[PDB]
Design a binder for these strands. Structure first.
Ligand SMILES: [Mg+2]
Ligand SMILES: [Mg+2]
Ligand SMILES: [Mg+2]
Ligand SMILES: [Mg+2]
Ligand SMILES: [Mg+2]
Ligand SMILES: [Mg+2]
Ligand SMILES: [Mg+2]
Ligand SMILES: [Mg+2]
Ligand SMILES: [Mg+2]
Ligand SMILES: [Mg+2]
Ligand SMILES: [Mg+2]
Ligand SMILES: [Mg+2]
Ligand SMILES: [Mg+2]
Ligand SMILES: [Mg+2]
Ligand SMILES: [Mg+2]
Ligand SMILES: [Mg+2]
Ligand SMILES: [Mg+2]
Ligand SMILES: [Mg+2]
Ligand SMILES: [Mg+2]
Ligand SMILES: [Mg+2]
Ligand SMILES: [Mg+2]
Ligand SMILES: [Mg+2]
Ligand SMILES: [Mg+2]
Ligand SMILES: [Mg+2]
Ligand SMILES: [Mg+2]
Ligand SMILES: [Mg+2]
Ligand SMILES: [Zn+2]
Ligand SMILES: [Zn+2]
Lengths: 50, 67, 60, 144
RNA sequence: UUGAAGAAUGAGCCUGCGAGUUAGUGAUGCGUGGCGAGGUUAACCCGUGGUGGGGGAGUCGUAGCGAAAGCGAGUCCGAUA
RNA sequence: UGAAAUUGCAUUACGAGUAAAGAUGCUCGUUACGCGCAGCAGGACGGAAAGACCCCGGGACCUUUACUAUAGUUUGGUAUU
């Protein structure tokens, strides 16, 4: 509850590529990251699903 | 009476051409977020069975070729 | 009663099947009603099912 | 002139039965079972692992599915076709290979391990790309 | 049974009887015989004369790999890596 | 006239030891002619009962706000209407 599991999906293809954890109090808002999309075949921006 | 095969064994183990008994690696069905890509890759293939376990599997199979 | 004097409908036997599926033996009885009939000028009571009542198979 | 009393089996053909529990000069008393326990009286099932989750339940099920309409091919290789049809085998049909060995009433895809120096015309169901290339280079063809 | 002459069990004695068997065209080895890239029949039919003959339907071997489509001395994960 | 329980045996001493840790049967000694009859109960861990106490495995019956069901009781809908 305090450190939940969050899924990072590409902002291009909506592909739920990664899963990680955060604190939900230190980072109340959805996280932006620069991850690698196996579908888009390059590094795209990944956002926490909502 | 024909002797039946073991249904879980039917569903879980393959027998290769040379006679090896192989199972799917265990531990990747869920709880995969904390597992690294290395741990997941280690659990992602097929495992050749040990001698005693392979003999037990071939006994449980009724001459069934595995899956 | 549970037997229809017309069409000879009789109870069926099956299972109580709970949430745990612990089956128990039980019965299904036909919806038998006791009604006055006048057949060939004879007045009497008859135990008839509602299916033969709906079909008009009994002369009231 | 052999007569019936000079018929005897081959040495080692008729192994003698081992009769158990017939004195201690042989497998006597416990009859090879040891003392006490389960094994002294019945047997142990092979699916049983003593109470620990067994192998056939700790391993994940191989999933997937079975194709209900999958049909297998009786495969023949070019080395076999060269060996069984060496003398400039002109046309080889499914009847010819089934006469040699292809297990008739089946489909007869021809595969391509081997060299196939001879020239053949194989009318068969399906073939591999390598087998077709080797057959055509040798001077022949495939059909059907 | 760690250990019994044991003051641990059983047996008064003799005679008789009393416990690893049988069935699968079961599973898996070995010996042996037949045939051999092939082996073998089941039910059944004929022999009212049997243990012999037919019957190849099926089945195991003949190619594997893949969840499978499929491809095939390769195939699958993979990007015709 | 005529049983019984019991019974591995037998030409079946005692002391101090030793030993599955309390020995007629083992050791070292001591004593002791053979066989009866009537008696007593210290021992043969005497007989009788596969300990009933204790633990372990199984069962049975009893209890309840253990679980899961269910007869009965009750609610409404619908058929009879
Ligand atoms: Mg999954
Ligand atoms: Mg992962
Ligand atoms: Mg109505
Ligand atoms: Mg003995
Ligand atoms: Mg015993
Ligand atoms: Mg023991
Ligand atoms: Mg044992
Ligand atoms: Mg069983
Ligand atoms: Mg064993
Ligand atoms: Mg457990
Ligand atoms: Mg021992
Ligand atoms: Mg003891
Ligand atoms: Mg004794
Ligand atoms: Mg004694
Ligand atoms: Mg005992
Ligand atoms: Mg006794
Ligand atoms: Mg056939
Ligand atoms: Mg002592
Ligand atoms: Mg003494
Ligand atoms: Mg002596
Ligand atoms: Mg006396
Ligand atoms: Mg007395
Ligand atoms: Mg006593
Ligand atoms: Mg006892
Ligand atoms: Mg109980
Ligand atoms: Mg009511
Ligand atoms: Zn993406
Ligand atoms: Zn009726």
């Amino acid at each position: 509850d305090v450190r939940p599991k969050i899924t990072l999906a590409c902002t291009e293809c909506k592909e739920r590529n990664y899963i990680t954890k955060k604190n939900r109090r230190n980072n109340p808002d959805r996280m932006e990251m620069a991850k690698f999309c196996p579908r888009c075949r390059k590094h795209t921006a990944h956002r926490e699903t909502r | 009476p024909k002797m039946k095969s073991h249904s879980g064994t039917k569903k879980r183990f393959k027998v290769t051409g040379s006679g090896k008994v192989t199972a799917r690696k265990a531990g990747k069905r869920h709880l995969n977020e904390h597992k690294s890509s290395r741990v997941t890759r280690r659990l992602t293939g097929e495992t050749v069975l040990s001698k005693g376990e392979a003999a037990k599997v071939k006994k449980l199979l009724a001459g069934h070729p595995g899956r | 009663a549970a037997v229809c004097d017309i069409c000879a409908k009789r109870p069926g036997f099956g299972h109580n099947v709970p949430w745990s599926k612990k089956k128990t033996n039980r019965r299904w009885s036909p919806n038998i009603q006791r009604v006055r009939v006048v057949e060939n000028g004879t007045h009497k009571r008859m135990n008839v099912c509602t299916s033969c009542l709906k079909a008009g198979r009994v002369s009231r | 002139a052999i007569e019936l009393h000079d018929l005897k089996p081959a040495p080692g053909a008729h192994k003698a039965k081992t009769r158990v529990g017939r004195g201690e000069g042989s497998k006597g008393k416990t009859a090879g079972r040891g003392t006490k326990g389960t094994g002294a009286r019945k047997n142990v099932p092979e699916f049983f692992a003593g109470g620990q989750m067994p192998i056939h339940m700790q391993a994940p099920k191989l999933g997937g599915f079975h194709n209900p309409f999958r049909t297998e091919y009786q495969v023949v290789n070019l080395d076999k076709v060269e060996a069984l049809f060496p003398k400039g085998g002109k046309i080889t049909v499914d009847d010819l290979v089934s006469v040699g060995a292809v297990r008739d009433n089946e489909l007869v895809k021809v595969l391509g391990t081997g060299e196939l120096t001879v020239k053949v015309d194989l009318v068969v169901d399906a073939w591999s790309k390598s087998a077709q290339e080797k057959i055509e280079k040798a001077g022949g063809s495939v059909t059907k």
